Design a protein around this ligand. Sequence first.
Ligand SMILES: [Zn+2]
Length: 1277
Amino acid sequence: PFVNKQFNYKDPVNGVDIAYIKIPNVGQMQPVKAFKIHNKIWVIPERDTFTNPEEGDLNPPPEAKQVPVSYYDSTYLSTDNEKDNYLKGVTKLFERIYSTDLGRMLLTSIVRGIPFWGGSTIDTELKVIDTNCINVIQPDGSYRSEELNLVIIGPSADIIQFECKSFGHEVLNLTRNGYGSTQYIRFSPDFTFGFEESLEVDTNPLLGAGKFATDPAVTLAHELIHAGHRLYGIAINPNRVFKVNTNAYYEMSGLEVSFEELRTFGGHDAKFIDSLQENEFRLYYYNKFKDIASTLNKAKSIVGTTASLQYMKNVFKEKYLLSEDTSGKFSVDKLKFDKLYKMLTEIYTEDNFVKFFKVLNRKTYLNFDKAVFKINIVPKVNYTIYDGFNLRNTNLAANFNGQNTEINNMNFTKLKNFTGLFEFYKLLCVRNDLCIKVNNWDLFFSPSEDNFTNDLNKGEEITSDTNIEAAEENISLDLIQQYYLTFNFDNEPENISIENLSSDIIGQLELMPNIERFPNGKKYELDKYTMFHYLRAQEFEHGKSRIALTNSVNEALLNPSRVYTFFSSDYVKKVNKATEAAMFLGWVEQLVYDFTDETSEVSTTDKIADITIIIPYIGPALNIGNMLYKDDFVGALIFSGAVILLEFIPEIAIPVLGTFALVSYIANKVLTVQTIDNALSKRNEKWDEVYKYIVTNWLAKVNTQIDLIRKKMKEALENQAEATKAIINYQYNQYTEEEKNNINFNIDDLSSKLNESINKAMININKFLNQCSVSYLMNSMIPYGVKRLEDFDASLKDALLKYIYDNRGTLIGQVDRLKDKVNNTLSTDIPFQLSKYVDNQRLLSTFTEYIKNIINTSILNLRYESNHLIDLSRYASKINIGSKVNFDPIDKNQIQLFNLESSKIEVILKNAIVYNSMYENFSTSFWIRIPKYFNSISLNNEYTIINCMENNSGWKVSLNYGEIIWTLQDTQEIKQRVVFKYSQMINISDYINRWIFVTITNNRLNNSKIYINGRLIDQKPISNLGNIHASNNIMFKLDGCRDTHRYIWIKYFNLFDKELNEKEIKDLYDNQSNSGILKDFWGDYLQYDKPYYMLNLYDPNKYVDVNNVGIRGYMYLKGPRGSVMTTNIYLNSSLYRGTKFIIKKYASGNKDNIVRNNDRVYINVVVKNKEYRLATNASQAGVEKILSALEIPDVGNLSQVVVMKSKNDQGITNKCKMNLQDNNGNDIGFIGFHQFNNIAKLVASNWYNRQIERSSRTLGCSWEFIPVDDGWGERPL
Ligand SMILES: [Zn+2]
């Protein structure tokens, strides 16, 4: 820390702060020269050759060590100059770490570390473990033993294998028992690791060229965070490793990250460790301190120094944060411990440092390094204490340029890795065997199910004084700030003179676990091609080959010029074809555009709330479609969901949650009323444990894969930009030889381009990916955990209601409100807040937009997507469709069901995901289309359409002559039904043979409500209905319809696990109305080329008629619209009356024949088997324009274009649908009628236009198109 005096290697040895140290090693050891950069921190610029006897050889091994990176140089750090530079650098980084709030705290705990005084000399005595000091040679040839705390030596054989090294004890775990021991950090500030980014692009649009460098400060900070854990004897056993599955062509051959490694990194990595294992360690170390206090509390004397036993007892007092009374006895304050621990453990972590140093760095310990570099930090022009490489001013500070080894090329010297490229690998063969050498450190992670401990099954007794939950403070920069203020920076252990030790202190390193070499080669003969194969087929041989030509098909990896793409053929074409230099730059522009073009394709799929943004070429870039129902990725993903992306499917074991036992209290109100609260509280806490648990499983099994792909794609895109830089190149590589011609093709600028083109591409691919992650979590992992909680919740309620009962008379004036409190709480879940377990601004931001759409909420949502009737909410397991089930050809999401026992659709919901307390509070909605009842059979005959019962298992939708019903019924067969009844004796009905939006709400504690088209039609209490069954499957089929020609049309069926409120209902309702598409009088999309009868909503008793064809003729509303009937059944005004209307395309045609909100069209009037053209003369007299049916060829420049409408300019629905316009583009007006001497001719008046803005009064322009429909038995006269 800080380091007071600036050293030089040659500066004269002086017995203190600069001496000839004799580290505690084995056997003899010529003394070595080390400096004292600070109280308790020495620096030896030698290669660690002393610490380990079996490590004096600094030469590389004929066999390679299984690590992604390695580097050797027998000669490094030999000269006396190299030492000085090493001295100058190790320092500058301590100053770097020290210049940060987080840094500052850590170096104060490290210097304060001080290995406990074990040396167990007689219980009651204190003493120094000689292995924690060093002998210091004084000038007069003498030597005085000195206590040490942390030492930095040079690397051993493998220069970049930095790590913590401590000497062990004959019978003590000085690193895992609380004692702590002097640490020797093998580190070098002359080499670094290069890594690659594929996320920061979101915040940095012009992110660096390629591989970035790792600020040496972080690496050193990472290693100290380790000395910290060990100094406080809190290091996790290195026998604790996150097990990894290896047998599989996609799995990593070998790799064993330690918990103490996932701990030290922090970020999410540290979240891979389950809660149960987390608290396992805490108590473990919390008891190591308790013994430290005991050990101290009974220490009478102290052999060794001339320092007061009190002084000593105090150092360790101030170290472990012990508390002592007036007698001087020590104790471990639990609450004060949890803090110290929380600091050494979660505040001081690599991720947290990457915040203080504002540098770019790996975002996970599982992001394997791909390089080594020779850097030189000493010169200020290169690296500064405050800015590092990203120097102030210098063009390095805009986008971590200083860290980009390509941009800041001058500061990084690419060295030779010593692990080839295929040292550790896997052999993957297709089905010409067709195999590939896939790199080990290039395959999937894949955690073993073992790692995830749990313990969620243990039940629990709930007394009155149980201890309630505790937050999950995500360690925000604010919390660190707090720790900083309350941080104690004054006073640092004194250099307590100890009595000389052996001239040669006997060492022997702590024993690390053995390196189990892993198998290599391992062959894999597969069926389908792999994402690895496809990726492979996009690299192509360096360059001395023949001008390669891009070419689809995986066989694109059989020719020496093996290259493949996922781009449109035309690109292949433009690239694969000679281009005369006369015309070359054009080509460049072309490709670039086309590249940045093909590379940015994004599907909106708005009609799919869940995964919005979509990058289609992913499927054919990594062969992700996983081969399903043949191609069409964007359709593939929609049919399955983000599952189609996982190289492997993770499971979720959420045991049958235990239960709370309730300790009862005899005639003790307080103590009782307090137990129920503890019960409910622990239950709330109970839900948190489950959620937090699946987020750990989701963080390592799922989210990790998606991230590998995230890299894979970024890899792909570059493989493409690299070839289109090869091809284009080969061309100009055979240039005309004419200088001054073109400001150079600038390969180092076409690239500056292709860079951006890809950087943005990743911004899209990333959003898309983030959605498949969050989304996969919400519909494939949470539902499971919830089921068990909801169960637990359903149980606890009884156990609680009973408790209250069994204790009434003691809960005298409260046996109701407590009965209400327990019934009111345990009647709704505990929302899943992702922010409670994740800081990631990326994913939370995602999670937020996902939550906004109430549809992603539904436990069942089935639309007709792509080419299937699927359950987008991923709850259904098998949706069996009948044979007599028909799907409207236009909007196939409109299902029609007949009376035939062969037309039916049955849906079964995954059992594991279904809890029986599921239909207490829940809603259901769908769109209905009921034909008209013509016969009398229909009378008093109630057929059922939707049924969900398991022997009296409530709710099933039924129909009966002019009314819709919803009946709830419990096992105790008690039933309750709510009904909406619609009369069939009306001129014009709002429900007959039309579409009706229906929503049914259910609140166990209240009533059952029925909403028709948004408004509440009726409600009936249900606070008396007993328990209800949860049917595993729902059946769509009519049942008991005596009518032979009865049928219905359903649409947008959904099922919600909560009581939708008025607002939600109305929102949901406006959303499923497709306001951008005009409608049939019955609700279907209006259509081009399809004769409709006009019904004027203002004067429903008349009907359009063409007085006389021609401009000298007119159209008007004719006399009395006839009636229709069938005594004792219906009496509706007739519809199929008057002249028909035909809408003709005019703007954007050939496409679907659906008429959309703002289409310009043509209205052909069909007069006497012939079709004419409704037009007018915009040069008439008044505001009104009479309109006539002209001869299509005689119309000419007369006003005829009509702008169809559906949403008022303001945005409100209006019936006024036809706005006529003059060719100049003007606005002649909406079409309506108008009295002209008691004749009311159809007219286009600019009046309505004005009114439609103000009010919303049904006007003379309120038209309605009526096609003939099998639902309206009426016969077109
Ligand atoms: Zn480490």
